[PDB]
Design a protein around this ligand. Sequence first.
Ligand SMILES: *[C@@H]1O[C@H](CO)[C@@H](O[C@@H]2O[C@H](CO)[C@@H](O)[C@H](O)[C@H]2NC(C)=O)[C@H](O)[C@H]1NC(C)=O
Ligand SMILES: COc1cc2c(cc1OC)C(=O)[C@H](CC1CCN(Cc3ccccc3)CC1)C2
Ligand SMILES: *[C@@H]1O[C@H](CO)[C@@H](O)[C@H](O)[C@H]1NC(C)=O
Ligand SMILES: *[C@@H]1O[C@H](CO)[C@@H](O)[C@H](O)[C@H]1NC(C)=O
Ligand SMILES: *[C@@H]1O[C@H](CO)[C@@H](O)[C@H](O)[C@H]1NC(C)=O
Length: 534
Amino acid sequence: DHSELLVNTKSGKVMGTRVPVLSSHISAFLGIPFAEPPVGNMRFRRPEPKKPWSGVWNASTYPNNCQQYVDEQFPGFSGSEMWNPNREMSEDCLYLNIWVPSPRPKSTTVMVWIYGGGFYSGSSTLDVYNGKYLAYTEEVVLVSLSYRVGAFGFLALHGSQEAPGNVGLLDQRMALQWVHDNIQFFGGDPKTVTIFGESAGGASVGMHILSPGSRDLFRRAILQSGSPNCPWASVSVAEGRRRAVELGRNLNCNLNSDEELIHCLREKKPQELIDVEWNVLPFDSIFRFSFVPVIDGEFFPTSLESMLNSGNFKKTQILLGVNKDEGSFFLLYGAPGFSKDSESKISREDFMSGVKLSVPHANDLGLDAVTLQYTDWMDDNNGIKNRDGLDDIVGDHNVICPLMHFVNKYTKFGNGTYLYFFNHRASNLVWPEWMGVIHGYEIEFVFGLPLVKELNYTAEEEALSRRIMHYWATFAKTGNPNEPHSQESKWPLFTTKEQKFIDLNTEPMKVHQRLRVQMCVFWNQFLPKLLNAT
Ligand SMILES: *[C@@H]1O[C@H](CO)[C@@H](O[C@@H]2O[C@H](CO)[C@@H](O)[C@H](O)[C@H]2NC(C)=O)[C@H](O)[C@H]1NC(C)=O
Ligand SMILES: COc1cc2c(cc1OC)C(=O)[C@H](CC1CCN(Cc3ccccc3)CC1)C2
Ligand SMILES: *[C@@H]1O[C@H](CO)[C@@H](O)[C@H](O)[C@H]1NC(C)=O
Ligand SMILES: *[C@@H]1O[C@H](CO)[C@@H](O)[C@H](O)[C@H]1NC(C)=O
Ligand SMILES: *[C@@H]1O[C@H](CO)[C@@H](O)[C@H](O)[C@H]1NC(C)=O
């Protein structure tokens, strides 16, 4: 061995770079391949392990981002472009980034970030995902993987070995397997690996907790604004097939067999599949994505619900939670009456239209049931109440409630649960006030962006970010976000009986119980029974 930026792994030697972080410095190994480029005949196929390389791999720069749809709704607007690919897109995108504190540790806690983006997008190279602040502040080895999104990572034709589906999830598993096998050489503890992600990434984390082929590869898990049982997180094999065939019809493909559909989809250029990607949705809706994980019977032995009921999942500690206004982002992009530059006061007519889009798989009685649940008949023509009520509908149906279901089901067999409710609006948030505490805006606090003075955050927002970063890191290290024998306020353990959680904001810690039970009893217990009877 030689320098601190030189690591000899089971795959080969890797050369990193010294990165500046808050006056100090740490190491960074960017763009390390954990799989063979899924290009050509391997498109849609399961990931193959990266053949070991000879010589030194240059890991000083960020890798390419996977082929995905690019947000062009508000050009120049940072609020929407901060989520867009900041590196060149390519199908050769299966790489991982590692931030190692300096001096290189011997055996410290490891955290693997799994980005979100509805399974149709996302990048590990984003600014809000820069793990250098967390790695440095909390003294952890921050890893951020990457996986194929869109059709490339989730096209599903059950029965076929050329495109079985869930390969995007297998990409994550191979990265986790690479972390299990090589993180030791970077000073990380393979015995203490915490996987954490947001939205689609949080659902992925929960999917790895459920899938037996992924359970042994990590210790603990953190789920942010995401759950494996989210209505948008997965589809049946029949629906996945239907969407795959529909994708082919949109590209003038031969649909007589799977062998011919796939051959066609493989000859087409990346952007060709992306341009027609949305055309396969079965309904006119919001918070719904085309190619997502499928219940194949392999990655997922049986239905997610049956697995959750039987305790068929990894027993360990989990830390999860949701943001206050999760639905705003989606109403702004597809619901009539919403716009980035207006207060977006919603009319009774637009409210009814919003409900239709929010619960696509519902009939008329179901639509009336949802409306009844979120309507104040004493003041039904209130524009602000209609706007906020619709925001609650999208967030509760798509994020909050399904997560609350997973929380209650998991805790019964689990070994420790910690629930949070992030309800703080960043003072420098570029999005309109009507959106509130937006889906994905806790990430900046998790990654410690508020510590960087040049980002215009307040003092209390830095204190909050430091508090959150420490909760996450301490939990990853021990299984409890609370510092042993500390004088600070204690974050209660979530139990099947008490059901406690905390608010994650700038004010002193406050403890509550039964996070949105009123609305979630409706979404998890009543509505599904109503739609089922009719
Ligand atoms: C998490 O799992 C650990 C290990 O199984 C539990 O600790 C045991 O708890 C039982 C009952 O209180 C004790 O009799 C054992 O002595 C404990 N074992 C150890 C090694 O400490 C722990 O209770 C579980 N925590 C939760 C919240 O379920
Ligand atoms: C056709 O185009 C469509 C475009 C979009 C949707 C549906 C569509 O059709 C149905 C959505 O539902 C997306 C709406 C936003 C959701 C939040 N993200 C940013 C973010 C990224 C990663 C984690 C957290 C936040 C920006 C787009 C975009
Ligand atoms: C790639 O490696 C070279 C040295 O071989 C060095 O300039 C740096 O680490 C990387 N250069 C570029 C342009 O990415
Ligand atoms: C911080 O404030 C300055 C002055 O208004 C502005 O120009 C800059 O863009 C802001 N930085 C960020 C990251 O918003
Ligand atoms: C769901 O609906 C189907 C069709 O009506 C019915 O056979 C089944 O029993 C229902 N499930 C429950 C739990 O009621």
